[PDB]
Design a binder for this molecule. Sequence first.
Ligand code: JQ7
Length: 283
Amino acid sequence: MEMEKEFEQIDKSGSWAAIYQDIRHEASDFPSRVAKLPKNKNRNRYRDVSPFDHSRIKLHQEDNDYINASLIKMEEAQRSYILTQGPLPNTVGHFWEMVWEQKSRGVVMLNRVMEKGSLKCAQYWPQKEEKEMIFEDTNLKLTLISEDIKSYYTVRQLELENLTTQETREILHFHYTTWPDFGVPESPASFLNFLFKVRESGSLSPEHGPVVVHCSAGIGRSGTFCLADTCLLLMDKRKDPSSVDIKKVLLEMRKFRMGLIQTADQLRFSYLAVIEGAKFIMG
Ligand SMILES: NC(=O)CN1C[C@H](O)c2ccccc2S1(=O)=O
């Protein structure tokens, strides 16, 4: 079926939970043996969220190459994404090592450091120009260059220096700051505006490594971001945009990381975002 009328048909029939459970039943199951090794327990935020072995990002390190991060490679859309958990106190150095080694331009953050009164990720970037951060375990230096605070999101320019080689690179930090503590946003308008700002920066384009996107577990809000982006790109590429099937795209992405889209409300929100976004693109 088309999307917008399939949407109204699920609303009128109140069957979002059943649609979402079907997706959960059909989703891929691949091994995640490296994630479960005892030496990696303090590298995982949640015991039930792990990268598959076949698609995990490897650190270029002979001691321990493990990080909780997955490469989502979308062949028809010609887009790739790295989805990862919010960094832990003992993985902030690994996080920036990955950004460097994968040649990423942008980092997309969809959570606040504290939500619901608890810590959802480490404070992994510097908040003042004159107070830079040094990660001694991976030999990187990180400096805040500029910060632009808007009503729904903040964009930061950061400098990452590999202290071994003295090479430097400019990284863009896109921080969506207004996702509610509970539920999903009422309108997708600010989330779509944010997606378009990431696109306009070059951070999603083939001349760079894959964008790094995270929330707390790296599957819920993070899944909503890449699902909406890929569906909109396919609608632009194809002769028949009504042939884009959001459930089929989601199942393709779940071949590369488990659990993408965590609730039936996130699934409904993803439909809403793609529907509204397809009108603004046009024409
Ligand atoms: N002095 C240090 O140990 C260096 N670190 C870098 C950074 O300050 C940071 C940020 C958030 C959490 C942990 C750390 S750290 O301890 O790894």
